[PDB]
């Protein structure tokens, strides 16, 4: 029932390198999730 989000930001074909993603937010939203979609600003 917990939605966990880890994030990392880097100022740069994905680059070849190692970077560890630290935790950002942990939320007890608790709903069921099966698919997802993205939003753009245009």
């Amino acid at each position: 029932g917990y939605f966990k989000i880890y994030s990392k930001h880097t100022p740069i074909d994905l680059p070849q390198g190692f970077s560890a993603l630290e935790p950002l937010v942990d939320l007890p939203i608790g709903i069921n999730i099966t698919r997802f979609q993205t939003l753009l600003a245009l």
Binding site: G1, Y2, P28, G30
Partner: protein, 48 residues
């Protein structure tokens, strides 16, 4: 005939009896579900 308006007024007044004065009520109901107990009541003592 036989038709009335079921909503009647309480008509509170300061000169009424103890039982005829308005007494606000607040009811709390507690629900426990399949959620990670997001509401809780925690005392912490000073450290040594």
């Amino acid at each position: 005939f036989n038709c009335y308006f079921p909503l009647r007024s309480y008509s509170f007044r300061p000169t009424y009896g103890v039982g005829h004065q308005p007494y606000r009520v607040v009811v709390l109901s507690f629900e426990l579900l399949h959620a990670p107990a997001t509401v809780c009541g925690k005392k912490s003592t000073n450290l040594v």
